């Protein structure tokens, strides 16, 4: 809603240690409205290359068919969720993207934003379950800090973000 | 640096989703010098009845032998350690505590302060590992947020604590 909770997490996001986007869901387009140094430093684009467009660029040509679909239903619906995307960086290398979604702000069956959190698969050796809920974790803390996740809660939450993530490694694991 | 070094950590401290606490490494008995709302909450302790005492006042008896041979290693040489404690609440209630103890400030040689977190083992269902890790994770970002983890060295270093910590799990069920 007030732009001190924007201020709070632009300054969130600039130091954080977890790749963070933050899109207006007010604009049909849904831009991206911040985007951060891990995620850039991921996706090898600058900043400038994303703010004022939609992330589904990242796809290039891959359809990403069921993940789309589940992710519409998502911001459709404001709730959270964690899904396996095919994308792309700048220079065409494909990484697999574990994407978590959280609304953010606004009314709780109308968030003004949406935070979209990457985890890049695959560059992990054999920890990647351990490595996805260690994400989950500190996605779980910088959630805390811009208010969306409650204190009391954070604990639970964090166990199940940290769980969700790796049974998603898992499923992506056994197959292919 | 030094006591305004100190209120950072202070600070962090304070808002933190992780239990924390704080041992001045430079005092005889090592004693803890800051101890956080969570770590309160976990242990039914008030700060007034932690600041200035050994963290042992969690244990009893001359219980967990091996694991504070092992705690009394990595304070000498101050080294990163993960190990599971047996603990009780204030009211006696026995807990088990997977302990994360890491050295702030100092050299190598000399830390100034080891920093402690407890996460609390048994409470996560079916989840114990991812949940573990988890921590860990959220854990990274805070030792990050006080200097003693390099920013771009986070996410490494994230990966690496929560596969530990993942593993510390696996073996603590895999005895019993
Ligand atoms: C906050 C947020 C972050 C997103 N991050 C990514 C991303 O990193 N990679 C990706 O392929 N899609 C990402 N998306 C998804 C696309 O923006 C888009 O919502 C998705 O492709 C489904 O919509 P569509 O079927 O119209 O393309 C993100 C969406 C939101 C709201
Ligand atoms: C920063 C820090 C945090 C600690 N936290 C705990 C704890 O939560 N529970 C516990 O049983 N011991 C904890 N300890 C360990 C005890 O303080 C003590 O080092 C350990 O029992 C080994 O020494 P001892 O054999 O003389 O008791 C912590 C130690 C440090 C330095």
């Known amino acids: 809603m007030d732009q001190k909770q924007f201020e709070k997490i632009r300054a969130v996001f600039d130091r954080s240690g977890v790749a963070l986007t933050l899109v207006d869901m007010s604009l049909p387009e849904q831009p991206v409205v911040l985007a951060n140094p891990p995620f850039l430093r991921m996706t090898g684009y600058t900043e400038g290359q994303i703010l004022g467009f939609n992330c589904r660029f990242l796809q290039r040509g891959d359809e990403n068919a069921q993940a789309r679909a589940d992710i519409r239903d998502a911001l459709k619906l404001g709730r959270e969720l964690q899904v396996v995307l095919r994308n792309y960086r700048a220079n065409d290398e494909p990484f697999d993207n574990l994407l978590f979604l959280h609304p953010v702000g606004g009314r709780p069956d109308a968030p003004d934003y949406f935070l979209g959190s990457q985890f890049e698969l695959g560059r992990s050796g054999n ?10 974790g500190a996605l779980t803390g910088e959630l ?32 292919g």
């Open 144 to 175: 805390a800090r811009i208010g969306t996740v409650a204190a009391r809660l954070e604990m639970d939450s964090r166990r199940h973000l940290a769980q969700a993530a790796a049974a998603l490694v898992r499923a992506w694991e056994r197959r």
């Open 127 to 136: 920890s990647e379950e351990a490595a996805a809920a260690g994400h989950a």
